[PDB]
Design an enzyme around this catalytic site. Structure first.
Site, PDB file in Angstrom:
ATOM      1  N   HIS A   1     103.582 -55.867  31.425  1.00  0.00           N
ATOM      2  CA  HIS A   1     102.412 -56.729  31.267  1.00  0.00           C
ATOM      3  C   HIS A   1     101.276 -56.009  30.558  1.00  0.00           C
ATOM      4  O   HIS A   1     100.849 -54.939  30.989  1.00  0.00           O
ATOM      5  CB  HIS A   1     101.960 -57.110  32.674  1.00  0.00           C
ATOM      6  CG  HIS A   1     101.010 -58.261  32.736  1.00  0.00           C
ATOM      7  ND1 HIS A   1     101.373 -59.548  32.404  1.00  0.00           N
ATOM      8  CD2 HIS A   1      99.723 -58.326  33.161  1.00  0.00           C
ATOM      9  CE1 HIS A   1     100.343 -60.356  32.603  1.00  0.00           C
ATOM     10  NE2 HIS A   1      99.335 -59.643  33.063  1.00  0.00           N
TER      11      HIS A   1
ATOM     12  N   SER B   1      96.877 -62.395  29.959  1.00  0.00           N
ATOM     13  CA  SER B   1      96.809 -62.485  31.427  1.00  0.00           C
ATOM     14  C   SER B   1      95.692 -63.444  31.864  1.00  0.00           C
ATOM     15  O   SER B   1      95.696 -64.597  31.450  1.00  0.00           O
ATOM     16  CB  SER B   1      96.616 -61.093  32.025  1.00  0.00           C
ATOM     17  OG  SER B   1      97.057 -61.067  33.366  1.00  0.00           O
TER      18      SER B   1
ATOM     19  N   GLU C   1     107.493 -58.618  32.689  1.00  0.00           N
ATOM     20  CA  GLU C   1     106.205 -59.064  33.224  1.00  0.00           C
ATOM     21  C   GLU C   1     105.875 -58.510  34.609  1.00  0.00           C
ATOM     22  O   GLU C   1     104.718 -58.273  34.919  1.00  0.00           O
ATOM     23  CB  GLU C   1     106.129 -60.599  33.238  1.00  0.00           C
ATOM     24  CG  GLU C   1     106.047 -61.257  31.850  1.00  0.00           C
ATOM     25  CD  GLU C   1     104.694 -61.053  31.177  1.00  0.00           C
ATOM     26  OE1 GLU C   1     103.800 -60.443  31.805  1.00  0.00           O
ATOM     27  OE2 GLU C   1     104.520 -61.495  30.010  1.00  0.00           O
TER      28      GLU C   1
HETATM   29  C1  LIG Z   1      94.462 -56.341  31.671  1.00  0.00           C
HETATM   30  C2  LIG Z   1      96.004 -56.179  31.733  1.00  0.00           C
HETATM   31  N1  LIG Z   1      96.431 -55.277  32.897  1.00  0.00           N
HETATM   32  C3  LIG Z   1      97.632 -54.438  32.556  1.00  0.00           C
HETATM   33  C4  LIG Z   1      98.791 -54.731  33.522  1.00  0.00           C
HETATM   34  C5  LIG Z   1      95.291 -54.464  33.495  1.00  0.00           C
HETATM   35  C6  LIG Z   1      95.497 -54.379  35.043  1.00  0.00           C
HETATM   36  N2  LIG Z   1      94.928 -55.555  35.824  1.00  0.00           N
HETATM   37  S1  LIG Z   1      95.885 -56.888  36.077  1.00  0.00           S
HETATM   38  O1  LIG Z   1      95.073 -58.050  36.059  1.00  0.00           O
HETATM   39  O2  LIG Z   1      96.954 -56.827  35.150  1.00  0.00           O
HETATM   40  C7  LIG Z   1      96.525 -56.710  37.629  1.00  0.00           C
HETATM   41  C8  LIG Z   1      96.679 -55.453  38.247  1.00  0.00           C
HETATM   42  C9  LIG Z   1      97.205 -55.327  39.537  1.00  0.00           C
HETATM   43  C10 LIG Z   1      97.588 -56.485  40.222  1.00  0.00           C
HETATM   44 CL1  LIG Z   1      98.247 -56.391  41.833  1.00  0.00          CL
HETATM   45  C11 LIG Z   1      97.458 -57.735  39.643  1.00  0.00           C
HETATM   46  C12 LIG Z   1      96.923 -57.832  38.361  1.00  0.00           C
END
Ligand SMILES: CCN(CC)CCNS(=O)(=O)c1ccc(Cl)cc1
Ligand SMILES: CCN(CC)CCNS(=O)(=O)c1ccc(Cl)cc1
Ligand SMILES: *[C@@H]1O[C@H](CO)[C@@H](O)[C@H](O)[C@H]1NC(C)=O
Ligand SMILES: *[C@H]1O[C@H](CO)[C@@H](O)[C@H](O)[C@H]1NC(C)=O
Lengths: 536, 533
Positions: free
Chosen positions: B437, B200, B324
């Protein structure tokens, strides 16, 4: 009279007729060909609504086809059966308002459902006398009464100065309507039932059938309708009043005629052939599947655009059969689009595809054209020339026929109509066009009319059975509003098309197969998205 | 005093800890400081190298997590809590971690450097799913992970200013990479074989080191999992960065110097309290403080840089998970919940699209709707739900990845691509979310090898397969076994063939075209539509 076949003498409102006894493969049929239904639209009558034929004296010989309406003759591939089959097969004349009737021999004693054919040809051509529209097989095998009429095409039928008295527009459609009125009054003399009249037509003939559905004065003249590969909505079947005016005035300039009254009076002094020779010079862009002189949204015959009329209309009383062939676009790539010909495999480059898209969607902005290219490109093989050729064909077919048909079927069903839909997928063993064109526009017609029953035409045995199946669907529909045969309810049923299930059937050598969604995804692009993109 | 656990680095001596992995011991050196604590006048500033220290520094435990917003969504739920900080929050957080085999490798060993994700607003190298002991033990890898500043502390920027130049969180990562070059040999790591991997925002970070010249001497290969530097969320323009920082300062009660001096007086939690109030539209998968196109770290937009760059000597492994977008629907879209099947209506779908594509004009939004609607079943709630997920996943991840893979391959890079399709048997999220994701991570790091976690034996074998691909890639720039034969091999991704592989319980299957038609819509058509609207 005294020594003639008594079955061939018939009286109609205008007078006495002598028909001819024809041979069909299964037995004789009666034909009454070249019956006049209007005064000849010549001289001062050019561009005017048709006037009813005044009664004649004595017995009119109705044993041969009459003249074809004056028209442009296609020059693509001279001597080639694939094109020649569509060309006029009688003398071209402005004196061409005649119709034809086929009935069983002897004529039925009980009143018989009537089928009325309206030919296509882009509103610039066609004739009820072509071999592929031969009514003898439907008459002999299904016992139908079949009628077909000539109507004016090109400038003679559709040149309009909207609002004028001398060229009001839509007169070719008024010719068709006059023939429908002739059937109402006279078809009983031939054993036909005026209370069971089904219109059918292909391409511009289908568009025409659609116009009669949307035009109030035609509504009392028929009961059911079949639209083969054509619709009144869509990008080619109508023009606005402004565009009709622009085309008529440019045409007038091109032939030396620069008040509407004076302009039209000068146009009437011009030889028919002069008008034909300039007819193709008035289109606003280089294009294919666009025709210079077509029905006009006049606020009279058509009170509004067909799109608007099918969005709001109540179609509860309407039963309709509509469909398309497998490859609607292929025929058109040769006529315009660099890189195509019936004489090579017509593999094209990506460059030829992009250029073809501008020609096939001539109203598109650059952004709209990009959207089309983006949708039809195979992004795994964006430069593959076989795929690009097939994609170009799909673009022309979907834009002009398949998606307009899907749109029509969808609107009619949502508004009460009983709709049956098909895709015709059988390629004639006798087809002279190359294999890559698949099942082109117009090549279901010979099957509906039952030409494979003629042994001299060399169709296979399976094609004959197939033809007989289609003739049964069409005449069942004409009789009952349902293409299915009762007392065969074990044979696969043809379900009506609905907004919820979107069912249509495949027409081919195999038993009916039910499918769902008429190019649903792709037609959403043409019918829902593209109009919004063009409007920006 | 285990001499395996005693290491001298440039700053001084460290004492690590002998850890247990299921197949034997590993050495861990946790909480190694790589920078001066970025606090007080150092808030918003580039990191400075850590000053040397006396005696033996205790590196037996994870250090503080960088100060950050903590997710409130489903309190106590493992699916969310697994991503929350598992150590105390502090601005004093610039520490890295090192795992090596026990005993220390005798020959120089390829190094894997993990960069966590979390939208540039969250994350920590101490999370259980980032445990490097399995890769160290089973594959003999030297594994490094660093904390880097997130949120305002890492990415608040007044572009052009001296006191908040932007991208300092990326500079933290870079300083840690520098630290590896200088020190990793002391652990048995090979500084001439360094592979960055991240997921990510971590993957986007890896991509930015690829695109930033001073970073390029600090690693040799890269893995980008479900994230890219190009795309709609990973960067902002200097103007938008300036707008957001200016708005945040207004919200907390605050000339660049005076503005930033005042922000520096605010307690950390006050900044975090207003972090989410600076976004220009209601949206999801958009983050307030992210890397900025500064003309410095990033000389131009990532899109411009991947278009024109020469990537000849680069090897990259990139990929996506099967679903995703599904995770994000709970976070803004009305109708979505981990607690029901989140079947949505058409109106909720149309509204969801405006949220998921916040930059879209009305016409662009309609293009998206018409593309993703199944016109055979336009009102069907389960399709609309899955379409909503596809929109968010394709727009933010799948299509940016396909774009990056295509650009890199066309400009000389060696690229390998995957789709990860296995749903963990232990997954706590509902079935409708599929493989969300972030859920390939536990497999790459080898967590199924931990018997107390109850993964199936198939999953344990699958995990070992993935650890092999990743470490083979780290070692050679090619994930294929150097001698373990057997078709099917994983072929390089090319612009012509567009081959990628599916990662699941079955053997590798080669597929062609990463959502090609749909990504042409996002990557070719939509930008045209937006420009002229
Ligand atoms: C580190 C991988 N993630 C697992 C999905 C942890 C959750 N944070 S995120 O960046 O995915 C994210 C969360 C919410 C929103 Cl709206 C956008 C991004
Ligand atoms: C109705 C029978 N037709 C179907 C084969 C024969 C050709 N006429 S057309 O209207 O399709 C047409 C074809 C090409 C061009 Cl350029 C213009 C009109
Ligand atoms: C799913 O859950 C949320 C509340 O928990 C709700 O808003 C949504 O409508 C639910 N789905 C249903 C049952 O329609
Ligand atoms: C088919 O029939 C014969 C061949 O047996 C041939 O002479 C004739 O020309 C063909 N007919 C047509 C119309 O193609």
């Amino acid at each position: 009279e005294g020594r003639e076949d008594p079955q061939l003498l018939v009286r109609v409102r205008g007078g006495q007729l002598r028909g001819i006894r024809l041979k069909a493969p299964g037995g004789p049929v009666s034909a009454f060909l070249g019956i006049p239904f209007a005064e000849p639209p010549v001289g001062s009558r050019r561009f005017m609504p048709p006037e009813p034929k005044r009664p004649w004296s004595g017995v009119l010989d109705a044993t041969t086809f009459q003249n074809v309406c004056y028209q442009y003759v296609d020059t693509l591939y001279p001597g080639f059966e694939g094109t020649e089959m569509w060309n006029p097969n009688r003398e071209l004349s402005e004196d061409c308002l005649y119709l034809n009737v086929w009935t069983p021999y002897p004529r039925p004693a009980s009143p018989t459902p009537v089928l009325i054919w309206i030919y296509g040809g882009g509103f610039y051509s066609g004739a009820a006398s072509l071999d592929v529209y031969d009514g003898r097989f439907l008459a002999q095998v299904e016992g139908a009464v079949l009628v077909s009429m000539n109507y004016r095409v090109g400038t003679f039928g559709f040149l309009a100065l909207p609002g004028s008295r001398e060229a009001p527009g839509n007169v070719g459609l008024l010719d068709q309507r006059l023939a429908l009125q002739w059937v109402q009054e006279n078809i009983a003399a031939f054993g036909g039932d005026p209370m069971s009249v089904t219109l059918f037509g292909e391409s511009a003939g289908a568009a025409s059938v659609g116009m009669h559905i949307l035009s109030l004065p035609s509504r009392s003249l028929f009961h059911r309708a079949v639209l083969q590969s054509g619709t009144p909505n869509g990008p080619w079947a109508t023009v606005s009043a402004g565009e009709a005016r622009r085309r008529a005035t440019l045409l007038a300039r091109l032939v030396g005629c620069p008040n509407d009254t004076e302009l039209i009076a000068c146009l009437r002094t011009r030889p028919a052939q002069d008008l034909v020779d300039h007819e193709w010079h008035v289109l606003p862009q280089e294009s294919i599947f666009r025709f210079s002189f077509v029905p006009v949204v006049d606020g009279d015959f058509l009170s509004d655009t067909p799109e608007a009329l099918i969005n709001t209309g109540d179609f509860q009383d309407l039963q309709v059969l509509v469909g398309v062939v497998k490859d609607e676009g292929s025929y058109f790539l040769v006529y315009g689009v660099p890189g195509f010909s019936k004489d090579n495999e017509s593999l094209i480059s990506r460059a030829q595809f992009l250029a073809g898209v501008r020609i096939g969607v001539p109203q598109a902005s650059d952004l709209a054209a990009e959207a089309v290219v983006l949708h039809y490109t195979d992004w795994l093989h964006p430069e593959d020339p076989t795929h690009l050729r097939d994609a170009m064909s799909a673009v022309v077919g979907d834009h002009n026929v398949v998606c307009p048909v899907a749109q029509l079927a969808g609107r009619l069903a949502a508004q009460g109509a009983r709709v049956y839909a098909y895709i015709f997928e059988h390629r004639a063993s006798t087809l002279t066009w190359p294999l890559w064109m698949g099942v082109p526009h117009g090549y279901e017609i010979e099957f509906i009319f039952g030409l494979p029953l003629d042994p001299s035409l060399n169709y296979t045995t399976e094609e004959r059975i197939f033809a007989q199946r289609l003739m049964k669907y069409w005449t069942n529909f004409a009789r009952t509003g349902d293409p299915n045969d009762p007392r065969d309810s074990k044979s696969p049923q043809w379900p009506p098309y609905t907004t919820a299930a979107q069912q249509y059937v495949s027409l081919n050598l195999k038993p009916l197969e039910v499918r769902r969604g008429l190019r649903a995804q792709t037609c959403a692009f043409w019918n829902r998205f593209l109009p919004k993109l063009l409007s920006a």
